[PDB]
Amino acid sequence: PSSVYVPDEWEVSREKITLLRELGQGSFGMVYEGNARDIIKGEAETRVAVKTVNESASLRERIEFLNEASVMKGFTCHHVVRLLGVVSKGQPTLVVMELMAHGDLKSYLRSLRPEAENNPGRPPPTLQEMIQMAAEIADGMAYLNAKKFVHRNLAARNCMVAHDFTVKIGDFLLPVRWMAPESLKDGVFTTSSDMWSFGVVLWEITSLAEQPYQGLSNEQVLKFVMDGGYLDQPDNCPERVTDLMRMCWQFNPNMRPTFLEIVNLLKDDLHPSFPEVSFFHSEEN
Ligand SMILES: CNC(=O)c1c(F)cccc1Nc1nc(Nc2cc3c(ccn3C(=O)CN(C)C)cc2OC)nc2[nH]ccc12
Numbered sequence: 001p002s003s004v005y006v007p008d009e010w011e012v013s014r015e016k017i018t019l020l021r022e023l024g025q026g027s028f029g030m031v032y033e034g035n036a037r038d039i040i041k042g043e044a045e046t047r048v049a050v051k052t053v054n055e056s057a058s059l060r061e062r063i064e065f066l067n068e069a070s071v072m073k074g075f076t077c078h079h080v081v082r083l084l085g086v087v088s089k090g091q092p093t094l095v096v097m098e099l100m101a102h103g104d105l106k107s108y109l110r111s112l113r114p115e116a117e118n119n120p121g122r123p124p125p126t127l128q129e130m131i132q133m134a135a136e137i138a139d140g141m142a143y144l145n146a147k148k149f150v151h152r153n154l155a156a157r158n159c160m161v162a163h164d165f166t167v168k169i170g171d172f173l174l175p176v177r178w179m180a181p182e183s184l185k186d187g188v189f190t191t192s193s194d195m196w197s198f199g200v201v202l203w204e205i206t207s208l209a210e211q212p213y214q215g216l217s218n219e220q221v222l223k224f225v226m227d228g229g230y231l232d233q234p235d236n237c238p239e240r241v242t243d244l245m246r247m248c249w250q251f252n253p254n255m256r257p258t259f260l261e262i263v264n265l266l267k268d269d270l271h272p273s274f275p276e277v278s279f280f281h282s283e284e285n
Pocket of ligand 1: 024025026098100101107283
């Protein structure tokens, strides 16, 4: 493992980063809420998420932390959480990401339940909002597929929610309840198995983040899904999203839609800004 990171236009002066509070444990270590001065042209200050590697990390893990930041430089998708800057001079290394103020999608969904103690005084997602979420997630996944990344871990806990409620793909032992039968059987992960996970995300949206296969152990889920089992439809689930889930959960991975096919299905009734920001409508597609 050697440093591929070139201290370039992405390099941010450490003193430009002010840390406000802990947000929680990320993959590599603590994630902080921060404020960054003059990192984006036209903005004097930018709210940011700041990732760090935990103190127990090896030298290798620190190098791998910085190499991941280097990879993220190549991504410019509105529906994938974006890198803003890197502090690689001295320790600790800081990886500065766009802030997603409403946190992960699973927790956000669970907050909108009628019984929730942390309910923000708003109704649960409307059909329109759920379709919008689905399209945004699908577009972000379409982009990563075009970049030749198989996600392997798609779940509501791994999607993030912005200030304006835009949903984006976040960070990319086994999550068996989100896994396709062929992955459970042979450990084969493809964009087609990512599509299976996408259907589970739709199920999480329409159940306000219930635990998939509640009342079944992980061993029972493994067998159930490999045998051709899949999730039941949530109570009063909109027909349109039920239809998407059905496609996603075809046993033959060849018979599942692609992420571009999903966006295309949903494109005719989305927010006006969608074609201006999406990978789907971009010249890159
Ligand atoms: C892979 N996990 C993370 O990166 C992560 C985490 F594990 C915990 C907390 C934050 C993480 N990452 C990011 N968070 C945010 N915004 C954000 C998330 C928040 C909260 C409060 C609970 N949150 C959770 O998501 C807790 N949840 C994991 C249970 C506040 C936030 O901004 C005000 N923006 C981000 N941008 C890039 C990473 C990131």
